[PDB]
Write an enzyme that holds these catalytic residues in place. Structure first.
Site, PDB file in Angstrom:
ATOM      1  N   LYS A 208      -2.918   4.938 -11.323  1.00 36.11           N
ATOM      2  CA  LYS A 208      -4.323   4.552 -11.461  1.00 36.11           C
ATOM      3  C   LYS A 208      -4.524   3.040 -11.385  1.00 36.11           C
ATOM      4  O   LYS A 208      -5.491   2.512 -11.941  1.00 36.11           O
ATOM      5  CB  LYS A 208      -4.947   5.109 -12.751  1.00 36.11           C
ATOM      6  CG  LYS A 208      -4.616   6.575 -13.042  1.00 36.11           C
ATOM      7  CD  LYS A 208      -4.770   7.446 -11.808  1.00 36.11           C
ATOM      8  CE  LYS A 208      -6.208   7.476 -11.352  1.00 36.11           C
ATOM      9  NZ  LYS A 208      -6.310   7.992  -9.974  1.00 36.11           N
TER      10      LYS A 208
ATOM     11  N   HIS B 141       5.946   5.644  -8.503  1.00 35.36           N
ATOM     12  CA  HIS B 141       5.656   5.193  -9.860  1.00 35.36           C
ATOM     13  C   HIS B 141       6.908   5.051 -10.720  1.00 35.36           C
ATOM     14  O   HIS B 141       6.787   4.816 -11.926  1.00 35.36           O
ATOM     15  CB  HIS B 141       4.687   6.151 -10.565  1.00 35.36           C
ATOM     16  CG  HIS B 141       3.422   6.409  -9.809  1.00 35.36           C
ATOM     17  ND1 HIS B 141       2.601   5.398  -9.362  1.00 35.36           N
ATOM     18  CD2 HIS B 141       2.825   7.568  -9.450  1.00 35.36           C
ATOM     19  CE1 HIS B 141       1.557   5.926  -8.745  1.00 35.36           C
ATOM     20  NE2 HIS B 141       1.669   7.241  -8.785  1.00 35.36           N
TER      21      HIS B 141
ATOM     22  N   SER C 283      -9.496   5.136 -15.985  1.00 33.22           N
ATOM     23  CA  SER C 283      -9.318   5.801 -14.702  1.00 33.22           C
ATOM     24  C   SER C 283      -8.408   7.014 -14.839  1.00 33.22           C
ATOM     25  O   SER C 283      -8.702   8.081 -14.289  1.00 33.22           O
ATOM     26  CB  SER C 283      -8.755   4.810 -13.682  1.00 33.22           C
ATOM     27  OG  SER C 283      -8.634   5.396 -12.399  1.00 33.22           O
TER      28      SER C 283
HETATM   29  N1  LIG Z   1     -10.393   0.467  -1.482  1.00 33.65           N
HETATM   30  C1  LIG Z   1     -10.459   0.613  -2.926  1.00 33.65           C
HETATM   31  N2  LIG Z   1     -11.134  -0.464  -3.289  1.00 33.65           N
HETATM   32  C2  LIG Z   1     -11.409  -0.688  -4.598  1.00 33.65           C
HETATM   33  N3  LIG Z   1     -10.986   0.189  -5.535  1.00 33.65           N
HETATM   34  C3  LIG Z   1     -10.299   1.281  -5.157  1.00 33.65           C
HETATM   35  C4  LIG Z   1     -10.026   1.511  -3.873  1.00 33.65           C
HETATM   36  N4  LIG Z   1      -9.335   2.661  -3.785  1.00 33.65           N
HETATM   37  C5  LIG Z   1      -9.181   3.142  -5.022  1.00 33.65           C
HETATM   38  N5  LIG Z   1      -9.784   2.291  -5.856  1.00 33.65           N
HETATM   39  C6  LIG Z   1      -9.628   2.775  -7.247  1.00 33.65           C
HETATM   40  O1  LIG Z   1      -8.117   2.856  -7.586  1.00 33.65           O
HETATM   41  C7  LIG Z   1      -8.110   3.846  -8.785  1.00 33.65           C
HETATM   42  C8  LIG Z   1      -7.032   4.928  -8.503  1.00 33.65           C
HETATM   43  O2  LIG Z   1      -5.878   4.179  -8.278  1.00 33.65           O
HETATM   44  P1  LIG Z   1      -4.491   4.951  -7.869  1.00 33.65           P
HETATM   45  O3  LIG Z   1      -4.443   5.120  -6.364  1.00 33.65           O
HETATM   46  O4  LIG Z   1      -3.325   4.117  -8.340  1.00 33.65           O
HETATM   47  O5  LIG Z   1      -4.480   6.291  -8.557  1.00 33.65           O
HETATM   48  C9  LIG Z   1      -9.299   4.308  -8.879  1.00 33.65           C
HETATM   49  O6  LIG Z   1      -9.963   3.505  -9.889  1.00 33.65           O
HETATM   50  P2  LIG Z   1     -11.294   4.045 -10.697  1.00 33.65           P
HETATM   51  O7  LIG Z   1     -10.963   5.327 -11.424  1.00 33.65           O
HETATM   52  O8  LIG Z   1     -11.692   2.989 -11.701  1.00 33.65           O
HETATM   53  O9  LIG Z   1     -12.431   4.285  -9.731  1.00 33.65           O
HETATM   54  C10 LIG Z   1     -10.002   3.978  -7.422  1.00 33.65           C
HETATM   55  O10 LIG Z   1     -11.451   4.076  -7.520  1.00 33.65           O
HETATM   56  N1  LIG Z   2      -0.900   8.707  -8.304  1.00 40.08           N
HETATM   57  C1  LIG Z   2      -0.252  10.002  -8.406  1.00 40.08           C
HETATM   58  C2  LIG Z   2       0.673  10.248  -9.407  1.00 40.08           C
HETATM   59  C3  LIG Z   2       1.287  11.489  -9.498  1.00 40.08           C
HETATM   60  C4  LIG Z   2       0.978  12.485  -8.586  1.00 40.08           C
HETATM   61  C5  LIG Z   2       0.052  12.241  -7.586  1.00 40.08           C
HETATM   62  C6  LIG Z   2      -0.262  13.233  -6.675  1.00 40.08           C
HETATM   63  C7  LIG Z   2      -1.185  12.979  -5.677  1.00 40.08           C
HETATM   64  C8  LIG Z   2      -1.799  11.741  -5.589  1.00 40.08           C
HETATM   65  C9  LIG Z   2      -1.486  10.749  -6.501  1.00 40.08           C
HETATM   66  C10 LIG Z   2      -0.560  10.999  -7.499  1.00 40.08           C
END
Ligand SMILES: Nc1ncnc2c1ncn2[C@@H]1O[C@H](COP(=O)(O)O)[C@@H](OP(=O)(O)O)[C@H]1O
Ligand SMILES: Nc1cccc2ccccc12
Length: 288
Positions: free
Chosen positions: A44, A99, A129
């Site tokens: 996240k 991760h 998030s």
């Molecule tokens: N191009 C982008 N620009 C800005 N924020 C982004 C983005 N893509 C994803 N995010 C945010 O990255 C978070 C998920 O990250 P990850 O890919 O590590 O799981 C989410 O945060 P939020 O839940 O605050 O919206 C997503 O909205």
């Molecule tokens: N960020 C994530 C952690 C663990 C599993 C996932 C599976 C799909 C997409 C994202 C993931």
């Protein structure tokens, strides 16, 4: 109730349904190529954002839109191969997402030829998030409240274990790896400069209009509308969602946690954060 969600290995929590212990035990001796690229994040923190960015940089079909292939197939999750791709036959330079913590890396990454880009984000926005994503996604246990999920989070009882241990083990062991550190918040503030720093660290050359295209297609609202990158089909049809209203790109704003955490929760978090992070010289942005 909670065993069926987490797979513990050497004190780290994998997602149980997406990886099997066979592949986990095989991670230590995994073949690393001298030009491999690894996006390492705590969940996240901007994982798929960075997937999109690196896909735009490294695959000109994706940037020019001559190819229409999902970013997860450009930078698949090293430990979560949900598309069953033969990583061995993937063409160099391979890009992976992961991760895992510093001490679980394939020993080939310690040869310091493959590069690692570590993306981090302030842990309160990460918490919120993760809270929403766990409410939405079936692969994670459904949390009840913000207080209870914050307790579950500070206990490390989530996929990825404790945020502080992840970031500390990666930073306090920089010199075992060829690695760069960059923050979700910096990418949010200056996308173009961040893309340029990524290209520099990856020593990948791009024209100016190519960088314009990368920034254009990696911006939040445009990327949410790009089905190759927004992960909509992947979460709806493959991973499964509890409702059908939430989305992987929910808000993407810095400072939203201030609407969820009370001052008491925030100050308790700050005490834990200062105890864990007072020596680490990473800049942290918490709002706007
Ligand atoms: N191009 C982008 N620009 C800005 N924020 C982004 C983005 N893509 C994803 N995010 C945010 O990255 C978070 C998920 O990250 P990850 O890919 O590590 O799981 C989410 O945060 P939020 O839940 O605050 O919206 C997503 O909205
Ligand atoms: N960020 C994530 C952690 C663990 C599993 C996932 C599976 C799909 C997409 C994202 C993931």
């Amino acid at each position: 109730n909670k065993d069926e969600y987490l797979l513990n290995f050497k004190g780290y929590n994998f997602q149980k349904t997406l990886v099997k212990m066979e592949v986990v035990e095989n991670i230590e001796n995994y073949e690393i190529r001298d030009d491999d690229i690894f996006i390492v994040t705590y969940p996240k923190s901007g994982t798929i954002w960075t997937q999109q960015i690196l896909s735009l940089i490294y695959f000109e079909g994706h940037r020019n839109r001559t190819e229409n292939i999902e970013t997860i197939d450009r930078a698949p999750f090293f430990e979560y191969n949900i598309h069953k791709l033969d990583y061995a036959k993937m063409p160099s330079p391979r890009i992976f997402s992961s991760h895992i913590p510093y001490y679980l890396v394939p020993k080939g990454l310690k040869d310091k030829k493959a590069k690692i880009l570590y993306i981090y984000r302030n842990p309160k926005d990460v918490l919120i998030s993760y809270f929403h994503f766990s409410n939405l996604m079936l692969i994670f246990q459904n949390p009840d409240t913000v207080e209870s999920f914050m307790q579950t989070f500070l206990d490390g009882d989530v996929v990825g274990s404790l945020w502080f241990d992840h970031i500390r083990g990666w930073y306090e062991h920089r010199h075992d790896f060829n690695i760069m550190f960059m923050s979700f918040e910096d990418m949010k503030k200056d996308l173009r400069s961040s893309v340029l720093k990524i290209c520099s660290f990856l020593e990948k050359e791009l024209s100016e209009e190519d960088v314009d295209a990368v920034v254009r297609q990696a911006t939040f609202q445009k990327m949410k509308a790009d089905p190759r990158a927004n992960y909509e089909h992947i979460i709806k049809d493959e991973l499964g969602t509890r409702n059908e209203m939430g989305s992987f790109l929910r808000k993407g704003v810095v400072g939203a946690w201030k609407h969820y955490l009370t001052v008491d929760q925030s100050e308790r978090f700050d005490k834990i954060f200062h105890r864990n992070m007072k020596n680490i010289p990473l800049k942290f942005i918490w709002d706007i």
